[PDB]
Design a protein around this ligand. Structure first.
Ligand SMILES: CCCCCCCCCCC(=O)OC[C@H](COP(=O)(O)O[C@H]1[C@H](O[C@H]2O[C@H](CO)[C@@H](O)[C@H](O)[C@@H]2O)[C@H](O)[C@@H](O)[C@H](O)[C@@H]1O[C@@H]1O[C@H](COC(=O)CCCCCCCCCC)[C@@H](O)[C@H](O)[C@@H]1O)OC(=O)CCCCCCC
Lengths: 518, 621
């Protein structure tokens, strides 16, 4: 009965509170304490995952309390296979991002000496609020945390960043908050509809009850209202997890923010968009999702190819990785909205693999960018000679983001592509071209940077490119280790994800299409 | 267990990568040892299968469930069948010989440990390719071989040519990978199984269109790997890498991957006459185009690449022959893994003696200066030419016999193209062999040679022997066919025309090409400057302009699309949001002008608030 889920999200926020409250002189102690809180949250995640039985009921570790009955929302947490997977992703990443951004806040001034403490506390608050969103089984609670986590990252981008930090932070927050406010419109519409229907005792936000009612058919509502509410949810989840048209904010912010914070935005937080698409959009609005399924599928595939192309066209390392993440988000959304067990399971595993892979690749690029203070690709050359280990890890990460079977991401992309073929073969081929496009923007980048004659000031002067330090080794090794393990033996993660995907597909009245042959 | 064959080299490579520079002194030993262990394990398993005669000769492990998602249930199984064992033995033996040779070849180069790491990873990848009993593990090995080829080709990163060649090779292989991925998607969506067993059991119910699509996409994948048109352009440029990399890629594992894919999917192709037609067309086109390219290649590496392309085209044609040519195709593939590997080792010895000289027209008379290397190269040369004692002669005769038995105008055209390929191959192989071993010394600077150390000698001698041995050892009595018969279909011996006349024609064309080459260089000389043959020769030095075809249609068009999409992003997607922002800002300024600061203007707005009065009064109507 222990509040495992509640503690899981509480610990990061309380840790941020303690950290920001430390004396400025305890900066080193602040770093260590933040790392310790992250590790404690990861241990909580470990116990939650171990106790979770994917063969058991859909929702586990369910904690329920009354929070705001006037709004029909209660503090209800419960972790399913998909939420468990993303929770494990967030937990494993956050300590690594902390030890990745160890010195990121050193060169800041002001904040009464709390710049390091502010950085770490903001990171912890983001981690905890993302966790709260993931394990929240209350629509309004989830929206609360989903929208609010924009603010800690808005600060984390604006402070602790490059020259365009102000502009990129504003664009990020405004895009995402406009989406969130559209989802607030949709949330209030959903509350009104539930209040207008006899299926519920009163206007309700309990996700489980609403899902059960819509599945049981009792909660019968006009398809027009459902379409509009679905669109409201979709706009916010699309701007959050960048669906092609709305991606525009992510490139700048990822470029401007410090690499650890940018990875925290992309690998962890942006996932919450697709997560919502998987949990709410499909399981609240099955008929609307089906009706809009072709258009969203088209948008996701176009996003895949479009992000791949733009990454190809990027002169900037960080912008290239951001567009690569956009294309991978296109993959995730495509796999989620194809409503195929292969598709949804592959897209969940793809959220995991893309989180880890982008984290590794982007952090390696961030170290390289730190060594020489230029983000321009042409500013480098022959780095493979000076920093062999940096180049090796960068190549491994690229291979991961390249969807090579020897690494994790392939297992997912494949699964998604397979899923897309059973319902939209043209779209499946259109996305499969991204296998080629990924090779392009990955290997061309590595060629321009690591190979060729060593560029000026690369191995000499005041800005040489020194190899990876031990701390960067600690950051990098676990990520590549997970990539290898999940590529070789995804069986545990897939076994966790599949029951949740099957539950979802049963919920929305969809099934994997039968093979052509009888 | 069979999986050890995969486990051994990969683990080796893993250590060779995980140990770092601390293993630079002894790593090569571990890499060669692990390759030799893989060869020993494969031989032991082959002996075991020989003991289990008849049926039950094939190994089948089915280790564990790999991706049990929905109806996929792909298990990480392995099948070392009568076909798979042949490739296992070839890959292991040739790779071990190449590792042993590379010991000396890469002795003077730092990261020799890293180079052997990459080679062992390559061997692991190729073994996984041939050992997977489902298409998912086959794709895993496919992409692994692609990555290993990239890494090894890119060895010597300081050379921009090496990096560019690696990138181009991997990207073309990735086009092939996309083709194979579409093939797998079709297989799953139509059958719901990805195993060889399930796919080949459900194949008979498949329509001609589905089978044609699957076979065509698999043939595209092979074109990617085996460097058939239109993806044949990457073969030439890869030679910027070390000679052993080219040897391993072209002779045994990388190049033969496409032929293996065709052979294993043989059940699909035989059930897809359109797919077989495509495979045959691709084989003929690749054979002719590669032979024409080799007709002009002056760099020993480039000429060897053209020769490999032509041989792979011949293998593709034979395999597209269906059950008729599967056996001959595989036999020639093995004989090639022998003689072409020996040719690459000899070429590497020549280059190491020539101070890394690449141009064949920059040296000669080496037969009087590199006797053992000259002899190994000559043995592989007699093999690739197709002398009756030569291994390649028997395999090529079998392929051409199947082509002739193909009948009709199609079979005649295929046979004629194969004969012309034999002739052109003889012509340019003769040009190369005369240019290096025969001819004037044509040395440059010091050019003081010496027979490569024993470590290099022994692998080269063994490859030459396997060129003289084998072919006959696999064609005499049809033992290779009787071995492949249980798992590789055998339709019948057409016997359209006597094998004797076909063999005589082959010998005649080989001799005619040899004589043409002699008159070109034996009576004439090897000019230092460009021979300037003009017309095709010019087009032949540019790889038949094939690279330009990529650089023009794709690279230029790809850059066009990239710039267009960048403009779209910066101007349409970003521009719409910026226009909305500008609208908001302009409207804010216009509204803010309404606060003129005159209290009487505010009062005027309030009195116009009689808008409220009129609206409430009109609310009745
Ligand atoms: C279904 C979709 C199919 C599409 C597949 C093609 C994808 C990309 C096409 C181009 C490519 O695939 O890749 C070339 C460049 C890298 O340009 P690079 O600069 O890297 O290399 C240059 C080299 O310059 C470097 O090399 C030298 C020497 O080392 C150094 O001195 C320099 O300093 C510098 O480093 C040198 O100087 C330059 O003259 C050359 O252009 C070098 O490239 C050259 O590309 C050409 C094209 O390539 C390909 O394989 C084409 C692949 C086609 C595969 C399909 C075939 C038919 C299939 C039918 C089913 C080749 O002739 C050689 O590949 C050669 O190598 O990508 C780009 O621009 C991408 C820009 C937008 C792409 C968007 C695609 C949608």
């Amino acid at each position: 009965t222990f509040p495992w889920l509640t503690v899981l999200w509480a610990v990061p926020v309380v840790g941020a509170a303690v950290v920001i409250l430390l004396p400025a002189a305890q900066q080193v102690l602040a770093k260590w304490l933040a790392l310790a809180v992250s590790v404690l949250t990861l241990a909580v995640t470990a116990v939650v995952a171990i106790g979770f039985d994917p063969a058991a009921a859909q929702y586990q570790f369910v904690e329920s309390h009354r929070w705001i009955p006037s709004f029909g929302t209660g503090y209800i947490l419960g972790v399913d296979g998909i939420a468990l997977a993303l929770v494990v992703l967030t937990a494993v990443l956050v300590p690594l991002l902390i030890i990745a951004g160890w010195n990121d806040a050193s060169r800041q001034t002001g904040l009464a000496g709390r710049s390091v403490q502010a950085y770490l506390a903001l990171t912890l608050a983001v981690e905890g609020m993302v966790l709260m969103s993931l394990v929240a089984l209350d629509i309004l609670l989830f929206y609360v945390f989903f929208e609010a986590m924009l603010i800690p990252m808005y600060f984390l981008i604006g402070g602790f960043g490059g020259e365009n930090r102000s502009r990129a932070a504003v664009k990020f927050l405004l895009y995402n908050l406009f989406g969130g406010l559209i989802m607030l419109a949709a949330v209030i519409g959903l509350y009104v509809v539930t209040a207008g229907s006899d299926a519920f005792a009163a206007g309700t936000f309990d996700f489980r009850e609403i899902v059960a009612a819509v599945s049981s058919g009792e909660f019968a509502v006009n398809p027009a209202i459902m379409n509009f509410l679905f669109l409201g949810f979709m706009f916010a989840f699309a701007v959050k997890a960048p669906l092609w048209p709305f991606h525009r904010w992510l490139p700048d912010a990822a470029v401007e923010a410090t690499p650890a914070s940018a990875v925290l935005m992309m690998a962890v937080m942006d996932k919450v968009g697709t997560f919502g698409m998987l949990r709410y959009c499909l399981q609240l609005f099955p008929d609307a999702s089906t009706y809009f399924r072709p258009v969203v599928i088209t948008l996701a595939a176009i996003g895949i190819v479009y992000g791949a192309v733009l990454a190809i066209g990027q002169t900037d390392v960080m912008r290239l990785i951001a567009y690569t993440s956009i294309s991978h988000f296109g993959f995730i959304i495509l796999g989620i909205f194809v409503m195929t067990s292969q598709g949804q399971s592959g897209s969940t595993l793809y959220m995991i693999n893309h989180g880890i892979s982008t984290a590794a690749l982007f952090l390696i690029a961030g170290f390289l960018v730190s060594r020489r203070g230029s983000r321009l690709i042409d500013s480098y050359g022959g780095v493979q000679k000076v920093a062999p280990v940096l180049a090796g890890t960068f190549l491994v990460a690229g291979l991961a983001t390249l969807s090579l079977p020897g690494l994790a991401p392939f297992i997912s992309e494949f699964l998604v592509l397979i899923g897309t073929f059973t319902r939209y073969p043209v779209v499946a081929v259109f996305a499969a071209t991204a296998l080629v496009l990924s090779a392009v923007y990955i290997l061309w980048t590595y060629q321009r940077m690591m190979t060729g004659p060593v560029r000026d000031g690369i191995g000499d002067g005041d800005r040489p490119v020194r190899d990876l330090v031990p701390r960067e080794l600690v950051v990098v090794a676990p990520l590549l280790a997970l990539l290898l393990v999940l590529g070789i033996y995804p069986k545990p993660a897939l076994d966790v994800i599949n029951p949740a995907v099957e539950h979802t597909l049963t919920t929305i009245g969809q099934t994997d299409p039968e093979p052509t042959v009888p | 267990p069979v999986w050890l064959l995969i486990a051994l080299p990969a683990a080796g490579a893993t250590i060779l990568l995980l140990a770092g520079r601390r293993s630079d002194r002894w790593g090569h030993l571990l890499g060669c040892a692990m390759s030799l262990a893989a060869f020993a394990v494969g031989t032991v398993l082959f002996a075991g299968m020989l003991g289990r005669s008849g049926e039950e000769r094939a190994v089948h492990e089915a280790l564990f469930s790999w991706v049990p998602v929905g109806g996929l249930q792909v298990d990480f199984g392995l099948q070392l069948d009568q076909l798979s064992v042949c490739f296992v033995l070839l890959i292991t033996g040739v790779g071990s010989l190449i590792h042993i040779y590379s010991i000396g070849y890469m002795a003077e180069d730092p990261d020799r440990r890293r180079f052997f790491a990459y080679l062992n990873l390559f061997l692991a990848a190729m073994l996984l390719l041939v050992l997977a009993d489902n298409y998912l593990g086959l794709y895993a090995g496919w992409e692994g071989v692609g990555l290993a080829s990239y890494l090894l080709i890119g060895f010597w990163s300081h050379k921009p040519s090496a990096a560019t060649a690696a990138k181009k090779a991997f990207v073309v292989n990735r086009v092939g990978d996309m083709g194979l991925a579409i093939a797998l998607m079709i297989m799953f969506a139509t059958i719901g199984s990805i195993s060889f067993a399930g796919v080949f059991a459900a194949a008979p119910g498949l329509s001609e269109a589905t089978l044609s699509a699957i076979g065509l996409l698999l043939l595209l994948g092979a074109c990617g790997k085996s460097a058939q048109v239109p993806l044949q352009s990457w073969l030439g440029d890869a030679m910027e890498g070390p000679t052993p990399v080219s040897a391993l890629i072209h002779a045994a594992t990388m190049v033969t991957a496409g032929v293996y894919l065709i052979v294993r999917s043989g059940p699909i192709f035989d059930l897809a006459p359109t797919a077989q037609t495509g495979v045959v067309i691709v084989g003929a086109v690749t054979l002719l185009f590669g032979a024409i390219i080799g007709c002009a290649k002056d760099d020993i590496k480039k000429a060897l690449a053209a020769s490999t392309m032509s041989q792979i085209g011949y293998m593709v044609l034979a395999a597209g022959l269906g059950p008729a040519g599967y056996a001959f195709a595989i036999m020639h593939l093995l004989t090639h893994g022998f003689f072409k590997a020996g040719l690459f080792l000899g070429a590497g010895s020549v280059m190491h003696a020539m101070n890394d000289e690449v141009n064949m027209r920059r040296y000669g008379g080496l037969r009087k200066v590199l006797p053992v290397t000259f002899a190994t190269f000559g043995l592989g040369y007699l093999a690739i030419i197709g002398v009756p004692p030569l291994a390649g002669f028997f395999s090529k005769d079998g392929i051409i016999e199947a082509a002739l038995g193909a009948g009709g105008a199609r079979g005649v055209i295929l046979g004629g193209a194969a004969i012309l390929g034999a002739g052109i191959t003889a012509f340019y192989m003769t040009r190369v062999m005369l240019m290096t071993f025969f001819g004037e010394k044509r040395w440059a600077a010091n050019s003081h040679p010496h027979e490569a150390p024993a470590v290099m000698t022994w692998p080269m001698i063994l490859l030459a022997v396997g060129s003289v041995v084998s072919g006959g050892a696999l064609a005499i009595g049809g033992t290779l066919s009787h071995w492949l018969e249980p798992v590789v279909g055998t339709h019948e011996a057409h016997h359209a025309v006597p094998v004797w006349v076909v063999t005589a024609i082959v010998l005649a064309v080989v001799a005619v090409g040899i004589a043409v080459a002699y008159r070109m260089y034996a009576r004439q000389a090897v000019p230092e400057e460009v021979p300037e043959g003009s017309a095709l020769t010019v087009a032949a030095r540019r790889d038949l302009y094939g690279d330009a075809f990529n650089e023009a249609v794709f690279m230029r068009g790809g850059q066009t699309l990239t710039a267009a999409m960048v403009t779209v992003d910066d101007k349409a997607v970003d521009g719409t949001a910026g226009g909305l922002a500008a609208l908001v800002s302009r409207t804010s300024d216009a509204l803010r002008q309404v606060q003129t600061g005159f209290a009487r203007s505010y009062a005027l707005s309030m009195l116009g608030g009689s808008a409220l009065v009129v609206a409430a009064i009109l609310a009745v109507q």
